[PDB]
Amino acid sequence: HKTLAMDVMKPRRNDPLLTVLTQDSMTVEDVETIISETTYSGFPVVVSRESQRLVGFVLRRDLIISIENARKKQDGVVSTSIIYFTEHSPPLPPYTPPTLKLRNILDLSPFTVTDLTPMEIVVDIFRKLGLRQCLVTHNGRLLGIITKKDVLKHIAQMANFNEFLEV
Amino acid sequence: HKTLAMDVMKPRRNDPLLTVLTQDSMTVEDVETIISETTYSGFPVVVSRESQRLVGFVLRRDLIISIENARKKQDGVVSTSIIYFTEHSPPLPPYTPPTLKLRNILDLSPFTVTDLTPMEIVVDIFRKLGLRQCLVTHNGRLLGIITKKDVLKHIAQMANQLFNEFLEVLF
Amino acid sequence: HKTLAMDVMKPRRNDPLLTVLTQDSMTVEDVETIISETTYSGFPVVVSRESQRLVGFVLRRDLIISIENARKGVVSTSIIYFTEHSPPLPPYTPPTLKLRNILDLSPFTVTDLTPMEIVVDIFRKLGLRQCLVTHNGRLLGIITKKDVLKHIAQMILFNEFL
Amino acid sequence: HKTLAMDVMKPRRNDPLLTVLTQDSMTVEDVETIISETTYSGFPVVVSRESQRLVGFVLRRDLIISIENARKKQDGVVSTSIIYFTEHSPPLPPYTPPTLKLRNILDLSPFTVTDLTPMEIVVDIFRKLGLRQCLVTHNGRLLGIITKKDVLKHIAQMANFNEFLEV
Amino acid sequence: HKTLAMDVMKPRRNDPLLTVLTQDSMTVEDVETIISETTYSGFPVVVSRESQRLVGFVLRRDLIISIENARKKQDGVVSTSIIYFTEHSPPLPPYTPPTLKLRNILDLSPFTVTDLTPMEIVVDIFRKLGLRQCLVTHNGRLLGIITKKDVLKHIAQMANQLFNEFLEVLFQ
Amino acid sequence: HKTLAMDVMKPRRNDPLLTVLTQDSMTVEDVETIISETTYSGFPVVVSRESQRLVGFVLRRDLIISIENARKKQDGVVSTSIIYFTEHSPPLPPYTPPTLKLRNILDLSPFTVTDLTPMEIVVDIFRKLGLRQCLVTHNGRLLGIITKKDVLKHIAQMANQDLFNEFLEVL
Ligand SMILES: Nc1ncnc2c1ncn2[C@@H]1O[C@H](COP(=O)(O)OP(=O)(O)OP(=O)(O)O)[C@@H](O)[C@H]1O
Ligand SMILES: Nc1ncnc2c1ncn2[C@@H]1O[C@H](COP(=O)(O)OP(=O)(O)OP(=O)(O)O)[C@@H](O)[C@H]1O
Ligand SMILES: Nc1ncnc2c1ncn2[C@@H]1O[C@H](COP(=O)(O)OP(=O)(O)OP(=O)(O)O)[C@@H](O)[C@H]1O
Ligand SMILES: Nc1ncnc2c1ncn2[C@@H]1O[C@H](COP(=O)(O)OP(=O)(O)OP(=O)(O)O)[C@@H](O)[C@H]1O
Ligand SMILES: Nc1ncnc2c1ncn2[C@@H]1O[C@H](COP(=O)(O)OP(=O)(O)OP(=O)(O)O)[C@@H](O)[C@H]1O
Ligand SMILES: Nc1ncnc2c1ncn2[C@@H]1O[C@H](COP(=O)(O)OP(=O)(O)OP(=O)(O)O)[C@@H](O)[C@H]1O
Ligand SMILES: [Cl-]
Ligand SMILES: [Cl-]
Ligand SMILES: [Cl-]
Ligand SMILES: [Cl-]
Ligand SMILES: [Cl-]
Ligand SMILES: [Cl-]
Ligand SMILES: [Cl-]
Ligand SMILES: [Cl-]
Ligand SMILES: [Cl-]
Ligand SMILES: [Cl-]
């Protein structure tokens, strides 16, 4: 009966899984096919798909420019080059291509809310803090995302309730 | 060096670990001793000690009332009764006393900030949202706590001193 | 230990009572003499001096303008009323004057026992120039914006009220 | 022209008087019966019914708890004890049963607005100070009450003009 | 795509030009006919008509009171008396009637926005600063006006659709 | 003496005129020497030096980036190439090099305040709108600039006093 963060977050019920980058296991081609196949403004970065523990958030525009420059740089970066967002590379097999550190375009302090947070509180946070997006979590794990336009679409939905009257 | 959330949060460098409750595995006696041995206004609730995954925040004031109400009823809840913050009671062996659900006093939406967040941005969040406290995390794992008083103490340190940074509180 | 509105409000203990105006018993001269003696930024208006019931607040800068323009059968013995209509006067008395349209009919009020941390809070959140202090419906004193500032200079717990 | 506080306040025209407490003359059963026959979140307290000079505002919650704990205390509190919200008891004859002071649960600083105050301002005050209710006075005389729920219903009705857009 | 200050500002396309006062060159009579023939709350005053450089904003009611009080004085102030909002009286031909200084009723700090400014930004400024009106310029030249009611009408129209700009208002 | 915007704005009487770019007549070489010789975060662009009519505000960051890119390209910009911020190019003599349109990095709606605006009002505006800087005009003409830091320093001066009541209002 009470609208919560999980009710508004994407993905919804019949939506695909959250489009996420791993901190350690994405190749340059993986991320490029993500950039070409999506229009999302940004991507959460997690430790692994298993943990779904949030490492940060990275914008599409930054990735394009970074990777674009990277292949353009002759450090030898190729398609099968592993990208990492950690300070140091992960352990790599004998004959593997040069890596690409993208730590410097990662937002290490993304705004996050619990899935059980009331939407009234999320709306308020968005207004007072001027958020462009919010990540939604359950017990430390990444579940979904709420953007500014999602918040607006939710407000619109209510407008047709007394919770709409207090916003 | 810019001051971050990790620089203001407790525990400080090489102090004992955050005083936390588990969502599942602590008894009334556990909580009783924690309450008895500490004066903290509240406690983070974590999935487990090894996971340190944040579940919520629970006030001492509220723990006291609930545990004292649980005693008076004399309905099986004893010192060896398990306290749980989940929706359902944890699976327990035979002859174990009834459990105590304290979920209704758990704040399941505590505010959180990464350990790397600039204190400037923390101070602003406290001001804009009127936070009583803030929890500090690393990669989804609970690390520390900052309270309104910790922020005020931090601001006071700047106030009478780097003074321009204090004036950033106005903006 | 807690400082209240009655500890900051004027008049202080043993000070001349509030320079107030009435709504039915204030002649032009009585107002002109008050302006020519005091230098307060504004004056409250009450039903009567005996009732001390708050009707509104009128600024000083607003009083002089309206008085000097109405005398250019308004004399020194003309009763000024802050109500909507003139009170019943004897047939011989000269015409009256209405200053209703320059009175703040919705001034802000606080009780004499209101904690200053709340008075200051209301001054910041509403941006008040002044606040009238009452006790059980009766005007008692006044706290201006400068009084709040002088109380802010008094005060650890200072940064908490920011 | 403008809608004023006296257009939204309760009680409405041809409605029953405000359910109020006196500061000196309510007994223990008097208040209890008032509590039982009403559902209002709270009640104003006035010097006397004749004066309607506002003394404070007390919540239903606090009245219930205070009164119940007073009978449990062996001060000798009974059904016919005088309840007062003043600092000291009213002049009583010696043979009268011990009294019950309830000043410590009275809001001595309730927010008040004059009846001529435009609702625009009232809404603003409610929004800026986050009020639960406001008391409406006329020349130092309590006239009515405006709660937050009252204000929201008023905003709702505005939509059905640009006094609405003003808010 | 998104609405600009120039889309909301008045006067609209092909209506008479902004009604302004010059800082230096208009007569008591000029202002009086403007006052009695319009209902605008106020008027921008500009350096000159050729420059359209904003000096300030002046309320109608203040002009009425000030001009009324002046003609009743006299000094001198006749229909052909020049009104100036500058600090000093303008250089004038010999044996002309006394001038009228109305600077003490001029708002020398009006708020201005460029015509290219998004309404979303304009609405936010009006809100946060509590503006009564806003003047709109092009490259330092006065072009138009937007009053609080103009903003309110804009928001109202926005609700009947671009519609996300109205949702941005309910959100801010 | 009530402090006004002209009292806090730069340049002060002792300073050289504002460092400004023109909308139409600066070459790439002109803007590069300016960037080399100054440390200002940004520059107002005016119609012309004589008119000082404001067109916008451009940042140093963006000037550097955009210019570095323009001269890297074949058949791109050279020292003598004219930069412009207008929608269309100015009329140039034939056989002159390619021009550089920098309209796309220009803030076309920079906040502006008249020189006679009380500083108290300027401060309110900075806080409420969250400005980085504010351009100060006299009768439509660009006169000076007030940056956030300028404002913070002005406030600090009022704090380090004992005038102090005027600082308390800011608090
Ligand atoms: N990385 C992601 N993975 C899955 N869904 C996402 C991701 N990022 C955003 N979304 C969701 O997809 C939708 C598109 O959001 P996106 O960030 O692409 O722009 P937006 O916030 O809708 O605003 P706009 O389209 O104006 O930039 C939103 O509902 C958002 O919650
Ligand atoms: N659960 C906890 N475990 C470890 N340290 C804590 C915990 N809770 C609070 N602290 C730290 O202990 C100190 C005091 O905590 P407390 O909860 O008493 O908050 P406080 O507001 O400082 O005290 P008070 O509410 O009386 O002003 C603070 O520095 C706080 O960060
Ligand atoms: N009507 C009044 N009667 C008695 N005292 C008053 C009255 N109005 C204000 N005061 C007191 O007079 C003192 C001076 O305030 P005053 O009204 O002169 O303005 P201020 O607060 O000094 O600010 P300013 O003079 O710059 O407008 C204040 O402490 C105020 O409480
Ligand atoms: N003491 C009172 N006497 C008369 N009417 C009252 C009194 N208190 C409240 N009311 C009116 O009764 C109605 C119900 O108000 P009440 O305080 O009971 O709750 P509310 O403000 O409606 O909020 P909620 O219904 O969610 O508890 C409101 O219109 C209010 O104005
Ligand atoms: N000097 C002016 N010249 C041309 N148009 C103006 C001028 N002043 C205002 N306007 C426009 O004329 C219309 C009426 O403006 P005006 O200020 O008279 O009333 P308003 O903004 O509706 O406020 P009010 O209800 O108090 O009269 C508005 O659309 C406004 O933009
Ligand atoms: N284009 C300019 N011409 C003249 N003076 C300027 C110009 N731009 C800024 N200033 C002034 O020069 C000083 C430095 O401004 P600048 O924008 O370079 O840095 P700042 O914002 O003051 O501080 P910071 O180094 O943190 O950005 C300030 O006093 C500012 O008012
Ligand atoms: Cl894990
Ligand atoms: Cl889990
Ligand atoms: Cl890790
Ligand atoms: Cl009467
Ligand atoms: Cl009486
Ligand atoms: Cl009394
Ligand atoms: Cl031009
Ligand atoms: Cl100087
Ligand atoms: Cl010119
Ligand atoms: Cl000039």
From Swiss-Prot, chain B:
Kidney. Moderately expressed in aortic vascular smooth muscle and endothelial cells, and at a slightly higher level in the coronary vascular smooth muscle. Residues 1-164 are cytoplasmic. It is found in: Golgi apparatus membrane; Endosome membrane; Cell membrane. Ubiquitinated by NEDD4L in the presence of albumin; which promotes endocytosis and proteasomal degradation. Changing residue 95 to A: Abolishes interaction with NEDD4 and NEDD4L. ATP binds at residues 19, 40-42, 147-150. Residues 9-73, 105-161 form the CBS domain. Disulfide bonds: none annotated. Belongs to the chloride channel (TC 2.A.49) family. ClC-5/CLCN5 subfamily. Interacts with NEDD4 and NEDD4L. Proton-coupled chloride transporter. Functions as antiport system and exchanges chloride ions against protons. Important for normal acidification of the endosome lumen. May play an important role in renal tubular function. The CLC channel family contains both chloride channels and proton-coupled anion transporters that exchange chloride or another anion for protons. The absence of conserved gating glutamate residues is typical for family members that function as channels. It is linked to Hypophosphatemic rickets, X-linked recessive: A renal disease belonging to the 'Dent disease complex', a group of disorders characterized by proximal renal tubular defect, hypercalciuria, nephrocalcinosis, and renal insufficiency. The spectrum of phenotypic features is remarkably similar in the various disorders, except for differences in the severity of bone deformities and renal impairment. XLHRR patients present with rickets or osteomalacia, hypophosphatemia due to decreased renal tubular phosphate reabsorption, hypercalciuria, and low molecular weight proteinuria. This is H(+)/Cl(-) exchange transporter 5. It comes from Homo sapiens (Human).
